[PDB]
Symmetry: C3
Subunit: 419 residues, 3 copies
Amino acid sequence: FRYMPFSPAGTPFGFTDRRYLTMNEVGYVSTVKNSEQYSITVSFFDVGRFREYHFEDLFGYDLCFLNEKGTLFGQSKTGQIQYRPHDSIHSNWTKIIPLQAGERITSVAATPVRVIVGTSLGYFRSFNQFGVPFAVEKTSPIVALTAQNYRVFSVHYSQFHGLSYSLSELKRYYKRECPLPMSLPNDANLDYYNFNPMGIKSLFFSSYGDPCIFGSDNTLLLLSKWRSPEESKWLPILDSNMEIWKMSGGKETTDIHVWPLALAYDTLNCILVKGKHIWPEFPLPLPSEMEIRMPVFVKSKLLEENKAIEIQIPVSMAAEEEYLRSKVLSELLTDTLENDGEMYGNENEVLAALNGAYDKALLRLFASACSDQNVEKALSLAHELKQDRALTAAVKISERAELPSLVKKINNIREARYE
Amino acid sequence: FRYMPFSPAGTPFGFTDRRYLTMNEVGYVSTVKNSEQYSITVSFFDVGRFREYHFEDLFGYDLCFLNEKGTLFGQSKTGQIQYRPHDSIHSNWTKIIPLQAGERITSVAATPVRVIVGTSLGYFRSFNQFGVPFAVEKTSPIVALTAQNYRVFSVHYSQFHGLSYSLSELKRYYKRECPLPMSLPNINSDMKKDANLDYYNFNPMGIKSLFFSSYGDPCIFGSDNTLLLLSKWRSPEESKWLPILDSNMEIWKMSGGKETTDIHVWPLALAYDTLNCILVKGKHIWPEFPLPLPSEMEIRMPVFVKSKLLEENKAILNKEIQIPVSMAAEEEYLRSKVLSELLTDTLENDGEMYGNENEVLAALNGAYDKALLRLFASACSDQNVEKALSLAHELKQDRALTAAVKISERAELPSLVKKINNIREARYEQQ
Amino acid sequence: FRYMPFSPAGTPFGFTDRRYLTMNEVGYVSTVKNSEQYSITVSFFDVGRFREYHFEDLFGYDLCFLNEKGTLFGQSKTGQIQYRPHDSIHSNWTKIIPLQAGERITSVAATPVRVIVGTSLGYFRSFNQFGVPFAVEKTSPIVALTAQNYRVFSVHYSQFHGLSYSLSELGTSSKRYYKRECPLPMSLPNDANLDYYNFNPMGIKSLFFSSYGDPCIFGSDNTLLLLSKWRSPEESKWLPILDSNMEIWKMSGGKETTDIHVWPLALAYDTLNCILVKGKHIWPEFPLPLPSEMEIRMPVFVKSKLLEENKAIEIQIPVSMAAEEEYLRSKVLSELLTDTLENDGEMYGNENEVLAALNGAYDKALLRLFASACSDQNVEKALSLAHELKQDRALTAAVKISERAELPSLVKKINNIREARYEQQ
C-alpha cells in the first residue's frame, strides 16, 4: 500500500502543469510547474482582510495547510516544512523533519499555537507557531490531518490497524484511534485515486468546532457528542449525490460534483465542479452553498411520486427530514453552548427558532398519522413534542380527527409536563 | 466480500424450496418458494399463548426478527420492511429504508419499543415500534443485529475495520466497535468439498445466532459452535468475553469420547445456565423441515483435556464420559464463579426480573463453595498447604470456612487450621 | 499467517544446538539439544540473591518466563506448563492446557499471584501461583506477554483485529484495568536473519515494564517505545525514546553499519540494558558477553544536518542543536517520574533527587535554546521558550540573557511572567 501526501481539498496535476495544494473557507493554494521549479500562489476569498501573494518553490512542496493566521508548506520526500505567517510582522521559519528510509510526510496542519506533522511510519511531531519542538509521538500511520485553534483531528490507516481517527485538544485525547465509519472507494478520474487512494476529499472542524469529514461517497459525516466518550456518534448529514439528483430533476448526471470547503452551522461551503473531472480546475468557480439534509429520502418512492412530471418531495417525507435535522442541530448547538458558550451572538435565538421548527415538523407527522387513523403512532409522536404550545396545537388537530381518547391522553401528557 | 442478509438462527435454501427466516425461544419463521412469490409461516412454541399464522409474500423477504410482541420482515434489496404485531388489535406498518446504489439491508431487529435496521454501508437506522424515525447513525458495515428492550448488540465487519461489535442502550454506548474474539469460518479445500458449503455462502461470518440472554447479557454463537458471553459489560474497563459452552466438546463427552459428525447444535437462546437449542441430526448442520422438538444444553466451562478425560474414564470403568469429582470441581468452581458474578451484577443494577433471582443466586453461591471445598480437600489430601489456604480465601460463606477447618483437621494440618480461623476472625471483625 | 511461541528476548536455534528461551533484567534461560531431550539452564545476573540451576527437559519447552519469584515453562504443542518457584520451599506444579487441533500456546507470563497463558485461538487462561484455575477468557489472539509485580502488559494480533495491546493490574487487594485491546502503534516487519523471522514473525524482540513501572516494547524497527500517562485513559501516549539504529549510526561516525545490533533486556530510568551483538546474526549467541548500556535519545536529529555540522566542526553535535533533544528528553522523563512519584511513591530512595536534577537539565536545555532565539533577534520565539521554564531562577537567568542580547521588549515581558507567578503563589 502506498501512502500519498494529503492536504485538505487538494487536487491532482492530471494532464495539466498546475493543481490546488489545499482549499477551505479561508482561501486556496495553487502550484504551477515551472521547469525545474514550481510557482506557488496563495489566494484568499476575503480580499479585504488578506492580500494574495506569490513565490517560487525550489523544493517542490506537495503538502499544504491554510488558516486565518498563516500558511504551512511541506515536502513529503525531503521532509522539509515551512510556515509562512500572513502578517509579515511575524517572520517565516523553515524546518527539516527527520525521515527514515521510505518514510514520507503524509499530512500537515497548523493552528495559531501549533504546527503538526504526520508520517507514513506513524510518527506524530508537534511544534509551536514559532517552530519549537514540543512532542514526538508514535501513532498508527497518519493519512489525514486537520486542526482548529486547540483541537486536532487526525485520521489513521494501516493494514495492521485498520481505519481509525483521533481527536485531541490542549494534551488530551477525547478519541484515541477509534474506528472511523467512513466509506472507502471501489475512468477519467483514475488520476485522482492514484493521488488520493483513501478518497478523503476533505476534513475539517465546523464553525462550531465539531469534526467533519467528506469522503469518496460524497457524504458529509459529523461527529456528535464528541465531548462524551460513551455518547459519541457519527452522523451522515449530507448526501451530496442525492441532493444533486433532486436538483437535476431525477437524472443520473456525471458532470456535476461537489468539492467540500467547510461547514457553516447548517450550510456546506463547497465548489460545484462541472465536467468529467470530479476535482476543480483553473480557473476556480465561485463558491456555492449547500444546505444539509438527513438521508431519509427514498429514491424509489421519489420515482413513484414524480412520474407525472426539481423533484417534488412529499410532506411526510419532508417533515421527517426537518424533524430529524432540527433534532440533530439542537443537540449539537446546546452542547456547544453549555461547554464553549455563545460564539457568534445569535445562538440563543438560533436554538430557539430551531426548537420551533422541530415542533412544526412533528405536528405535520402527527397530522398525517391522525389522517391515517393511526391512534398509537400519533400518541407516540405527541410525547416527542417540546413546547407546551405545540401540545396545545396537537389537541386541535386531534379534535378535528374524531379521536377523543387521543385528546384525553395528550391532555394527560400536559398534566405530567405541568409538574 | 459479499454482505449477506442476516437473521438469528436463519437457514439457507440449499437445493430445497424452503428455509427458516429466523428462530429463537419464541418460535420460528419459515418461507417457501411459491412460483414468483413466497409462503411465509410464523410458528410458536407456546401454542396456548400465540396463534400460528400464514400469509403470501409478494416482495421476497429475506430478513426477519421475532419477539414476543411481533414479527419484523425485511427485503435486503429494496429496503422494504414490515412490522406485524401478533395481536391484530395493533395495525401492521410497512416502511421503505433509503438505500444507495449497491447498499443492502444486512440485519434487522425489534423490541417492544424499538425497530432497528443495519446496512452494508454501515447505516444504522432506529425507529419506535410504530415506525417513527429517531436516529440515523454511520457505523462500520453491519453484519448482524440483535436487540432486547432498549439494548442493542451489533456486529461489524469490513476489510478496513476488521471484526468488531458494539453494545448500546437507548443514547449510550457501553462498547463502540471493540474487537470481537469470535472465530471466522475456514473455507479451505475440505469445506469446499463439504455438504454445508451452502450455509457459509449464506452466512459468511458463520454467526449461527446472537442474542441477549434472559438476564440481559450479550451472547453470540459462531462457526466453532462455542457460546460466547460478554461479562461485566456495564463496566467498560472490566468487560471480558467468556466461552461458556463448547458444544463440540460437550457432545463429544455425551457420545462417550468419540468424534461424531452427525450431531449439530442450533442455538435459540440462553436461559440463565441452559442453552435452548435444536439438535440437528444428519449431514447438514442447519435444521430442516419438519423441525424437531427444542432441546436443552447446560453450559460448561472448557477446562478439560480430551486425553486426560479418556484415561480417567477408563480407570473408573475398570474399577457419557465419567469425570472424577476433584477434576469436575474445577469446571464447577469456574462456572459458578462466572454465573455468580453475572447474576450479582444483574441484581444490583436491574433488580429481580422474574422474582426468584435471589434464591437462584443463593443456590449458586452454595454450589460455588461446595466446588471450592472439593478442590480444598484434594489440596489437603496432597499435603499442599499453600494451595489449600489459597482456595480457602475464595470461599464466600463463613460456614464454608468452618467446613474447611474440619477438612484441615481430618487431614491433620494444624497450621492450616489456625490460618483459616484467622480468616473467619478477620471477616467477622470487618462487619 | 502463522502464530509462533513468543518469549521476551528469546533466540532461535539457527544452525546451533542451543538457544535462549528468554532474557530479561533478572537473568536468562537457555536450552541445549541433548540427544532426544534438552538441558535447561536458568541463570541470574545477581548471583548473590538467586541460585543458578539446571534440569533435563523431556517435553521440549519452547516457552519461558522468568521473574524474581520463579520460572514458568511451556510447551506450545502439547499445552504442558510448569511453574518452578525459585525458593524450593514452594513445590513445582505442572498443568496441561486444553488445546484444540492446531491451537498453540503463543505466550506465557507470571505474577506473584497469577500464571497466565495465551493461545493462538484467542483463549486466555489464568491460574494462581499454585495451579488453581481462576479464569477462562476469549480475547484477540495474544502474541506477547510481560509482567512486573502485579501489572500485566499483553500484545494482541489477528488479521481481523489488527495490532493491539492491553494493560491491567490485578494485585493482592485491588483490581484495575488500564487498557483493553487499544491499538498498538508498533511497526511490523516487511538473508542471514531468515531463521529469526520464521522464529518471530511479529518481530517483537522484547517487551517489558521499565524499572519505574512503565510499559516498553522493542520491535523490528529497533526503536524503544514507552507508554506515557498510562494511568490516565485520555492522556495516554506512546513515545519513541530510542532509535537504536540512529544512535549506532552516530557512534560509528555516521557510517551505515550492518554488523552491530541491539538486543533489549530492560529499561533503567534513562538507560537501556542490552546486549551488543556483533556479526551477521542480530540475536545473541552462546556464550553471552557482558550486558551493555545505551542511554536513551529522542529521534529529533536529521542525518544530513548532523553530517554537515560534524564536517564544519562519534558524531559531534552543536550545543544549540543538541539542546532540543535534551529539552524533550528531560521533559518526557520528568513527566513520567512525576507521575510515578505521585501515584506509587518513592521506590528506590533517590527519586526526589533524580527528579530535581532532571528539572535542572530541563531548564538548562531551554535556556540554551532561548539564547539561540535571542541570537537571531527572534523575540516571539524566545518569549515562547520562556513560558516553558519551571524554576523562577531560570526565568531570572532568561532576563539576564535577554539584557545581554539588547532585547528590551523581551526583558519587559519576561518580567511580567515573574511578576504574575509571584502573586499566584
